[PDB]
Every structure is written in structure tokens, then in C-alpha cells.
């Protein structure tokens, strides 16, 4: 299966990476904010 990288590359799939960044972003961001808020208070 040659010419599979270039094609998919130039085409850039279809907003695929967006999904990953969306989920990974919400989790990573949220997680950080949680640790900060929790570690900040510490009761």
C-alpha cells in the first residue's frame, strides 16, 4: 500500500486530529485545574 502517507498527508484526513485534541485538551486542562485547586486548598 504505497502512496498512502502522502495522500492522507496532503488531504490531512478530515478534522481527525481535532477530536483527539478536543478530548485530550479537556482532560489534560481539567485535570490540571483540579490538582491546582485541590493542592491549593488542601484540607
Curated annotation (Swiss-Prot):
Changing residue 34 to M: Increased amyloid-beta protein 42/40 ratio. No change in apoptosis after caspase cleavage. Expressed in the brain and in cerebrospinal fluid (at protein level). Expressed in all fetal tissues examined with highest levels in brain, kidney, heart and spleen. Weak expression in liver. In adult brain, highest expression found in the frontal lobe of the cortex and in the anterior perisylvian cortex-opercular gyri. Moderate expression in the cerebellar cortex, the posterior perisylvian cortex-opercular gyri and the temporal associated cortex. Weak expression found in the striate, extra-striate and motor cortices. Expressed in cerebrospinal fluid, and plasma. The record marks 23 as: Susceptible to oxidation. The record marks 21 as: Implicated in free radical propagation. Changing residue 34 to C/S: Unchanged amyloid-beta protein 42/total amyloid-beta ratio. Changing residue 31 to I: In AD1; increased amyloid-beta protein 42/40 ratio. Changing residue 34 to G: In AD1; increased amyloid-beta protein 42/40 ratio. Induction: Increased levels during neuronal differentiation. Proteolytically processed under normal cellular conditions. Cleavage either by alpha-secretase, beta-secretase or theta-secretase leads to generation and extracellular release of soluble APP peptides, S-APP-alpha and S-APP-beta, and the retention of corresponding membrane-anchored C-terminal fragments, C80, C83 and C99. Subsequent processing of C80 and C83 by gamma-secretase yields P3 peptides. This is the major secretory pathway and is non-amyloidogenic. Proteolytically cleaved by caspases during neuronal apoptosis. It is found in: Cell membrane; Membrane; Perikaryon; Cell projection, Growth cone. The chain crosses the membrane at residues 19-39. Residues 12-39 are annotated as: Interaction with PSEN1. The record marks 4-5, 7-8, 28-31, 37-38 as: Cleavage. Belongs to the APP family. The transmembrane helix undergoes a conformation change and unravels partially when bound to PSEN1, facilitating cleavage by PSEN1. Binds, via its C-terminus, to the PID domain of several cytoplasmic proteins, including APBB family members, the APBA family, MAPK8IP1, SHC1 and, NUMB and DAB1. Binding to DAB1 inhibits its serine phosphorylation. Interacts (via NPXY motif) with DAB2 (via PID domain); the interaction is impaired by tyrosine phosphorylation of the NPXY motif. Also interacts with GPCR-like protein BPP, APPBP1, IB1, KNS2 (via its TPR domains), APPBP2 (via BaSS) and DDB1. In vitro, it binds MAPT via the MT-binding domains. Associates with microtubules in the presence of ATP and in a kinesin-dependent manner. It is linked to Alzheimer disease 1: A form of Alzheimer disease, a neurodegenerative disorder characterized by progressive dementia, loss of cognitive abilities, and deposition of fibrillar amyloid proteins as intraneuronal neurofibrillary tangles, extracellular amyloid plaques and vascular amyloid deposits. The major constituents of these plaques are neurotoxic amyloid-beta protein 40 and amyloid-beta protein 42, that are produced by the proteolysis of the transmembrane APP protein. Cerebral amyloid angiopathy, APP-related: A hereditary localized amyloidosis due to amyloid-beta A4 peptide(s) deposition in the cerebral vessels. The principal clinical characteristics are recurrent cerebral and cerebellar hemorrhages, recurrent strokes, cerebral ischemia, cerebral infarction, and progressive mental deterioration. Patients develop cerebral hemorrhage because of the severe cerebral amyloid angiopathy. Parenchymal amyloid deposits are rare and largely in the form of pre-amyloid lesions or diffuse plaque-like structures. Functions as a cell surface receptor and performs physiological functions on the surface of neurons relevant to neurite growth, neuronal adhesion and axonogenesis. Interaction between APP molecules on neighboring cells promotes synaptogenesis. Involved in cell mobility and transcription regulation through protein-protein interactions. Can promote transcription activation through binding to APBB1-KAT5 and inhibits Notch signaling through interaction with Numb. Couples to apoptosis-inducing pathways such as those mediated by G(o) and JIP. Inhibits G(o) alpha ATPase activity. Chelation of metal ions, notably copper, iron and zinc, can induce histidine-bridging between amyloid-beta molecules resulting in amyloid-beta-metal aggregates. The affinity for copper is much higher than for other transient metals and is increased under acidic conditions. Extracellular zinc-binding increases binding of heparin to APP and inhibits collagen-binding. This is Amyloid-beta precursor protein. It comes from Homo sapiens (Human). The chain holds residues 686 to 726 of 770 of the full protein.
